[PDB]
Symmetry: D2
Subunit: 480 residues, 4 copies
C-alpha cells in the first residue's frame, strides 16, 4: 500500500493509489483485457489490437489530471482527496459494461436479440461496478482511505449513468463541475474522448489533431446560473469545434469503415445463430445465454471476445451454421458492399422504418437485363447517424467560456463569433447497402437495384453511380 | 553516385548528383538563413526551421509522387528526364522567399514597392535563372540527359505557371499530369503543402491530421478533356476536404497568430525605417536597399534574416529609430492586441480600403468617460483573408476522381455527394485591431473605439465584447 | 489486384494478390489470437499486439530489402519470383508460434513433452505446408509464375535453414544473399528483428534508437568466398553493435521483466494442470491435448490464447486446480520475487542443474531466528541466458563490410577497430528466485535463505542484500 | 500570473512572471541566434534549433524535478523560493555560450586566446550578473519572496559550482538542490535530459532514455550527512543506458566527421577575421571576436550573425576569411582521410596536438607518389570520448534506494548489474583530414596516414586494406 506505477504508451508513467489497484485487481475489471476497443475494426486496421482495459486506465488517469489541475489553480473550490479518488474510480469504471467486440454488442447484437429491453453500456457499467464492489470487499477498503461508501458509491454511479431542482445526491451544487469530467452530459467534452482519440490514433495509424493537455491548462471553474462549472478560455473555441470535427473524421475513416461494420454484422449473425446453444454459468449455477448474460453479472463477467473463438472452434453440429459464418470471415468471403447514399431535403429516416429497407431495395425495378433476381433477404441496409454528440444541436452552444480580462466571469460564444467556414448542420445519416450473394452476377444486379432505389427515393447520387450503373443514372435529371 | 541526407520528417532521402550541384550554390544555401514561419518563432519556440530543409522535402516528395505514377502506369512513358525536372522544380520553388518569409512578400514589399506586382513565385524563377547561369549547371544538366532549352522552360513553368488552347511549352498535353505535382494551379493539392504540414507541425508542437503517403498510393493518371491528369480515388474525397480544413486550422492556430502577426508588423516597421540606410552589395559592386534588392539577384542572394541583426546591433544614429523598434521586440513591449471581428453579409473589404481603416476606428464616437483621446496613427488594423486556396471557390470541384470498378474513367463528385457537415462557404475575412499606445488608460480607450466601430459597421460582436466594453454592447440590438 | 493495408509502424503497405490468398486462410488468421509478448501484456498494458500484425510487417520489410538490392544492383538478376518467395517467407516465419508465444516453446513444451525437441521454426514449416495443401495455394503460385516444387523448398529453407559444401537446394550460390533477409543464420541481422524492435517499442512505451531504413539504404551485395552476401558499409559498424545493445536492453526492461516472467510461469503451471482434460479436435476427428496438438496441424491451428479463457471460465472440478492458478493471476496474488544474482568467474550453470536449484536454496543455513522453515517446492529458480544471439560469440565478427573507395570489395572489421567502450563479453546468466508462499514471515525467511545461498555459492551480492538480510551479508568479506 | 509556452518536446510549459522578466531581456533573447549543434546543421538539416529553446526546456525540467521531490517528501521543506532559484539556474546555465556553441569555447577561444581559461559556465555566471544588473531584476526578485544576497549566490553556485561544506547559497540539508541543474557529482542532470530529447527530435535519430521514469522514481535520502537525490536500485541499467546513449549521440551526430571539419573551417575564418571585426561594448570601447568575452555588453552582441557578417562583407581585409566561408557554401571542404585510435596506454596530451600534422607529413610510405604533402596540408583532430568523468564510472558515484526500505541509501557496483557493460569508460579518436582535394593528393594523404598509424602503433583503419594495399602488409598485427 503505496503508489503503483504503470507504463502506458499514450500517457507515460501513470501513478495509481492503492484503492484503485484493489479495484483493478478483480475479475470484473480484468475482464476488460478480453474486449477489443474497436471490435471488428481490428479486422481492417491490424494495429487496432487494443482492448478496453488499457483504455480504462487512461480514462482514470486523465480524470485525475483534470481534477488535480483545477484544485491546484483554484483552492477555493475545496476539492478533497475524497473527490479526487471518486472521480478517478468513475474514470476507471465507466467501461465495465461493454460486451464482446464493444459497440458490436450494445449497437447491433442486443438490439436485435433483446429488442424489448433498453440496454446501454452505461447501465451495464453501473451494475458491473456494484457487482465488483460487493464481490471483492471494496467498501471496507474505501473506508480505510476516508471515503464514505453510501455517498461516494452514489457519486461514482451518477458520474457514469447520470442522475438515478439539483438532481444529484452524491455531491452538492458547489461541486457541480465534478460531474463534467468523466462523462459530460452537458456537451460531451470529457476525458473519455480524450483518451480514445489519442489511443485509437496510436493504434490505427491515423494521427491525433486534438491537444487535451492544452485544454486542461486553460480550464477554469466559474459560476453559471448558481452552479459552479468548468469553463474554457474564449480563444480556445476553435480548438473545440476542431475536437468534434476530429471525432467525426475518426468515425468516417475508422469506426464506421464499411468493411469493419460488415464484419461486426457477420459476427452479430453468428452470435444470433449460436444463442440457442451456448450456455454460460452465472450465480447459483443458473445457466444464461449470450443474450441473457446481461441479466446476471456473474455470467456477464465471463462474456468476452472468447465467444467468437468458442464458436469458431466448436464441433457440435448444432453450432454448424454459426461456425460457418465465422469461417467465411477467416477466408474473407464477406458480404459485399454495394454502395452508400444519403437522404435529401428535410427527409429523416426513422428507427421503425429500418427493417423495411431491404424490401424497398429488392422492390426497385431497374431497366437493365438481369441474369439473377435478388430478394429482400439478400440485402443488408445499414443506417448510420453521424453527429456532434447532441443529435441536431451544436454542442459548443452548451459550453461556457471566460476572457483573460475577467477570469471569473462566464460568457457564451455563438457560431457566428467564430467562423463562416464551420458546419451549418450538425447531424446527418449515411445509408450503406450490402449484398449477401457474392458472385459477379449477383453483385452486378445488386448495384442496379441500389442505384434505382436511390433514384426512386430522391437520395443523393452514389459517387460511383455512373460507373456501376451507367444504364440507371441517366433516368434522373436531378443528377444530370 | 547518390548522396543520402537524414531529414527528421522524411527519413533517409536519396539525392541525384545533379540535385547536389544545384543545392551546393550560394543561391540555394541562402535558404538556411530564412525562417519558414518568420515571426512565428517568437511565439512558438520550436519553430526554428528554415526554408532550406523545407525545400529538400518538397524535392523529395515531388520525386516520390512522380516515381509512384511511373511504376504503376508504364504506359505514361515517364522518363528519368521528367523525374529530374520535377525534382528540380520541387527543390527550387522556395528560392524566391525573403527575410522572415511571408513577412517580406506579404507586408514589406507591398508597402515599400506597391507599384511592382511581386510574388515569391516570380522571385524563385529569377533566382533559379541566376543560380543556373552563375554556377555552370547547363553542362551538368546535359551530362545527365536533360535538354536545357526545353527543360529549363519546363522547370520555370512548374514554379510560376505559363510564361506567355494548351498554354505550356515545356511539355505536351500527354504530360499534363506533371504540372500538378510541385505547384498545382488547378486545385492547390501539391507536394509543397504536404511537406509544410508535416514539418511545421513537428516544429510547432501541433500534430498533423493529413496522410500524403496514403494519397500517393491511391493516385492515378486518367484522361480528362484530352489531357492526362492526376486523379484521386473516389472515397478519398473526405480526406481531401480534411486536407483543406487542416490548412485553415494551422493558419488559425499558428501562421496567423495574433502576436506572431504583430511581431511581423513591428519587424516590417523597422525594415521601412532602415530602408534608406542599409546597403546591400550586388553586381559590379553597385549598392541596393532592402526594398530594391529584388531587382538584382546577386544582391537578393545576400538578403536574409541577418538584416534583423545588422539593424539590432548597429551603432549608426541614422538607424536609431529602426533599432529602437527591434529593441522593443526583445523586451516584449509590443503593440497590444485590442480584438478581432468579422464583416456580416455580402460586405467584403478590399485592398484599397486598408489604409482608411485606422482612420475609421479613430472616428468612432464611443459614449463613455474616456481619460484619453487616441488618433489614427495609434491603431493598426490587420485584414486577413482565410480560404481554401481558391478565393470563394470549393477546390474539390476541380479534382478528378476514379472509381474501383473502372480505374481509367474520370468522374466528378459534388459537395452534396460527400456530407452535409462540410462548410457552406469557403472564404472569410478576419479583422484584428492593435494599439501602439500601451498604458492602462490607452487600452481602455482603444477597446471602446474598437467595439463602437464594430457596432457602427455591423461587424460581428467581439468574443469578449461584454467584458472589455460593458457600456458599449447594449446599444447594439443586432447582438441579442 | 494490389491490396493496401494501414499499419501504425510502416504506414500503407501494398500486398500482391498471392500474399492476400496466403493471408486469408485459417492458418494465418490464427495469429490474431496469439499475443507477441505473452505475459508481458500483464505488465505493460499497451502490449496488446498479436503475432498477425508482426507477420505482415516482417513480410513487408523483407520486400523492402530485396527490392532495394534489385534497384541498386540490376546485375544480381533478382526476379519478381525471388521477391515473392522472400515476402512469403517473411510472412510465414511466425506461423509456428503457440499460445502466449515464447511461453509455449520456451516453458510449456519442454516441461510437458521433455523427450521431443520442438521449435517455433519447425512449427512454421509444418504449418506452412498445411496452409498450402489445405487451401489450394500451389495452383495460385503457378498463376503468378512461381514454380511450386523449387519455390516451396526455398521458402521453407529461409524459415528453418537447410533441410537435410553448399547446403541449399531452393536457390544456387549466386543468390545466397536472399537467405540473409528473413532469418539470418550467419549473424542474426534480419528483418524479423527490425519489425519487432519498432513494433514492440510502439506498444510498450519504450523508444528504440535502431534505424533499419538507414541500414537498408547502405546495404550492398558483394563476393565473399564464392558466395554473394549482403555487406554493410564500414562506418555503419557502430550502429550494428548498437542494434544488439538495443536487443539486450529490450530483454532487460521488457521481455525478461521479473513479473512478466512469473506470470508466464503461472500460466505454464495452469496449462500443465489442465493438459489431461482439454481436448482439441484434429484431422479426421482424432482428439489431442495442448501438449500433443503439435503433432497434427489441424489441431495446432485451433491452439491459441483462447486456451487461457477456456480454463478460466470452466466449471468442471477436473479443472479446479488449473482454474485457481489463473484466478490468482486475476487477483494479483502472484508468486513473489525474492531477488536476482549472477555467477562469478568461469562458472556456467548447466541445462541439467536447473531442477536442483530450488532444493539448494532451502538447504542454506542462515544464522537467523525464523518463524517458519521453507521446503524446496516453495521456491522457483529461473535461469536466463542473455547474449548477442550467438552464445559467447560476437556477431559482428560474422558481418561483411564494404568501403566507399571500393564498393565491390568485402572486408572484415574487428572490435578494436571500433571502440574500447564496447562489451568485453557477449553472454551472461541471470538467476531470479521466487517464493510460492507470500505472507510476511515466509517472505522474510525466503530472503534469508536466498541471500545466504548467494554467499554460499559465491554469486554476486543482491543489490538489496544489506536491506532484506542485514544479519547475513556481514559474514561475506568480499561484499564490505 | 503564469504565461504558457508550447514546446514540441515538453508540451505546454508554465512560466512564473519572474522567469518571464528574466527571459524578456537582450541577454537571454541572444540565445535565439546561437545554434545548439553549431556546424552539425550543415550535415543534419533538421538541426536548426537554437540555445534559446533548449534553455526553456532545462528551466522547465529543473522545476519538474524539484516539484516532484517536494510533493513526495514534504519533510524536506522545499520552498517556493527554492523552486524559483532552481528554475532560474536552469534557464540561465546556457547564457554563456558563443557563436556556434561548442565551436566557440571548444576550438576558437583556445586557439585565439591560449593564455586564458574560459568555459561556457564562467560566461553563464558573468552574463547572468550582467542580465540582472542591466534590467532591474533584484526588486522583482524581492517582490516574489527571493532574498538577492543568498539567492543570487545560490543560482551562480548551481551553474559553475562553489566559488567541509563548500557552498554559501543553501546549507547541507538542501544539498540535493545542487544535483538538479548541473550535477558535478555524476553528471545526471536535467540539462542532459532536455538535449537528448530535443537533439533527437531535430536530428532524426530516436531517443532511448526515459527522463520521466527517472523523475517518478527519484527520492531524497541521507548519504554521509548530506541529503542527496537517490535513484531506485533496479533502474541502474537505465542509467548505464543513459551514458551509452550520450556516447551514441556523440558518435553519430555531435562528432560527425564532416560536422567537425565544418566547425574547423568556420574557426579558421573567425581567426582570419579576428584583427578586423569590431564589436562595440560598454562605454563605447571596441572589442574583437576573441576579446568580446571580457565585456558582457559586447558579448551580448556576439552570435552566429558573425558568420554572415563575414560572408557578406566586401572589405578586402576580410578576403581570406570570406573565401573560406565561400568554400563551405560550394561544399569544397577539407577532405576526410581516415580515423584511428591509440593502443595500450598511449594517451595523447593537449601539449602534443600541434605536433601531429608534422608527424603525418614526416611518414615515409614505401610507395611511388606523384605529389608530396607537408604539415600545413594536414588537420589532425583528437576527440576524448568518455562517460563525463574522464577514466571513472559515473554510476559508482550514484546513490540508490530499495523498495523494502526507501529511506536507506545504498551503493551498487558494476558486477552487481551486468558483465555486458563497457570495461573502460574513456578513449580517444584521431581523425585526419587533407586540405588539398584533387585525386593525386588524396591518394598521397592516405599513404602518409596509414604509414603514420603503423609507425605509431595505432589501430588499423577500417578501410586500410583498400586505401593503402601496399602499406598494410608491413605491419605485424594487421596481416
Ligand atoms: N526500464 C523500463 N522502461 C520503461 N518502462 C518500464 C521499464 N521497466 C518496467 N517498465 C514498465 C512495466 C510497467 O508497466 C511499469 C512498472 O514496472 P516496474 O517498475 O518494473 O514495476 P514492478 O511492480 O515490477 O516493480 P516493484 O514492485 O519492484 O517496484 O513500467
Ligand atoms: N548513424 C547515423 N544515424 C542517422 N543519421 C546519420 C548517422 N550518421 C550520419 N547521419 C546523417 C547525417 C546526414 O544527414 C546523413 C548522411 O551522413 P553520412 O552517411 O555520415 O554521410 P557522409 O557524407 O559523411 O559519409 P560518406 O561521404 O563517407 O558516405 O545521415
Ligand atoms: N482515411 C483513411 N486514413 C488512413 N487509413 C485508412 C483510411 N481508410 C482506411 N484506412 C485503412 C484501413 C486499411 O487497413 C487500409 C485500406 O482501407 P481501404 O482503402 O478502406 O480499403 P477497402 O478494402 O475497404 O477499399 P476498396 O476495396 O474499396 O479499395 O487503410
Ligand atoms: N491552438 C494552439 N495549439 C497549440 N499551441 C498553441 C495554440 N495556440 C497557441 N499556441 C502556442 C503558441 C505559444 O507557444 C503558446 C501560448 O499561446 P497563446 O495561448 O496564443 O498565448 P497568448 O499569450 O498569445 O494569449 P493571451 O496572452 O491572450 O493569454 O501556445
Ligand atoms: Mg510491483
Ligand atoms: Mg460521451
Ligand atoms: Mg560524403
Ligand atoms: Mg501552394
Ligand atoms: Mg477491398
Ligand atoms: Mg532470429
Ligand atoms: Mg500573452
Ligand atoms: Mg554539465
Amino acid at each position: 500500500d503505496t503508489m503503483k506505477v504503470i507504463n502506458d504508451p499514450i500517457h507515460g508513467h501513470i501513478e495509481l493509489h492503492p484503492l484503485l489497484v484493489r479495484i483493478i485487481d478483480t475479475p470484473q475489471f480484468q475482464r476488460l483485457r478480453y474486449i477489443k476497443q474497436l471490435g471488428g475494426g481490428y479486422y481492417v486496421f491490424p494495429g487496432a489490437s487494443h482492448n478496453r482495459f488499457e483504455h480504462s486506465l487512461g480514462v482514470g488517469y486523465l480524470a485525475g489530471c483534470l481534477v488535480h489541475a483545477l484544485g491546484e489553480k483554484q483552492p477555493e473550490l475545496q476539492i478533497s482527496e475524497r473527490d479526487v479518488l471518486c472521480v478517478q474510480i468513475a474514470g476507471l469504471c465507466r467501461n465495465l459494461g461493454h460486451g464482446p467486440f464493444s459497440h458490436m454488442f450494445d449497437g447491433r447484437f442486443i438490439p436485435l436479440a433483446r429488442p424489448e429491453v433498453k440496454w446501454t453500456h452505461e447501465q451495464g457499467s453501473v451494475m458491473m461496478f456494484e457487482h465488483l464492489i460487493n464481490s471483492n470487499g471494496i467498501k471496507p477498503v474505501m473506508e480505510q482511505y476516508g471515503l464514505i461508501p453510501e455517498e461516494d458509491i452514489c457519486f461514482i454511479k451518477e458520474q457514469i449513468v447520470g442522475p438515478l431542482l439539483w438532481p444529484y445526491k452524491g455531491r452538492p451544487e458547489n461541486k457541480s463541475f465534478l460531474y463534467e469530467i468523466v462523462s459530460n452530459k452537458r456537451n460531451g467534452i470529457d476525458v473519455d474522448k480524450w483518451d480514445y482519440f489519442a489511443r485509437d490514433c496510436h493504434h490505427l495509424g491515423i494521427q491525433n489533431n486534438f491537444d487535451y493537455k492544452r485544454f486542461i491548462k486553460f480550464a477554469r471553474v466559474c459560476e453559471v446560473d448558481n452552479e459552479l462549472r468548468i469553463c474554457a478560455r474564449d480563444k480556445e473555441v476553435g480548438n473545440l469545434y476542431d475536437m468534434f470535427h476530429t471525432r467525426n473524421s475518426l468515425h468516417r475513416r475508422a469506426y464506421q469503415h464499411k468493411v469493419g461494420n460488415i464484419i461486426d454484422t457477420m459476427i452479430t449473425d453468428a452470435f444470433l445463430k449460436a444463442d440457442d446453444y451456448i450456455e454460460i454459468t452465472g450465480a447459483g449455477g443458473k445457466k444464461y445465454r449470450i443474450s441473457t448474460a446481461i441479466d446476471d453479472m456473474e455470467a456477464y463477467t465471463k462474456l468476452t471476445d472468447n465467444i467468437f473463438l468458442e464458436i469458431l472452434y466448436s464441433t457440435d453440429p448444432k453450432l454448424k451454421d454459426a461456425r460457418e459464418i465465422l469461417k467465411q470471415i477467416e477466408y474473407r468471403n464477406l458480404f459485399k458492399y454495394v454502395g452508400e447514399t444519403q437522404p435529401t431535403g428535410q427527409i429523416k429516416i426513422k428507427r421503425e422504418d429500418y427493417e423495411s429497407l431491404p424490401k424497398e431495395v429488392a422492390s426497385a425495378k431497374p431497366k437493365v437485363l438481369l441474369d439473377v433476381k435478388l430478394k429482400a433477404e439478400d440485402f443488408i441496409v445499414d443506417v448510420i447517424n453521424m453527429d456532434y454528440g447532441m443529435q441536431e444541436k451544436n454542442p459548443i452552444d452548451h459550453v461556457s467560456f471566460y476572457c483573460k480580462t475577467a477570469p471569473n466571469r462566464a460568457i457564451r460564444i455563438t457560431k457566428n463569433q467564430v467562423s463562416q467556414l464551420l458546419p451549418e448542420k450538425f447531424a446527418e445519416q449515411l445509408i450503406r447497402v450490402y449484398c449477401k450473394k457474392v458472385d459477379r452476377k449477383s453483385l452486378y444486379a445488386a448495384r442496379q437495384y441500389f442505384v434505382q432505389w436511390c433514384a426512386d427515393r430522391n437520395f443523393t447520387k452514389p459517387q460511383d453511380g455512373d460507373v456501376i450503373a451507367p444504364l440507371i443514372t441517366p433516368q434522373k435529371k436531378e443528377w444530370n
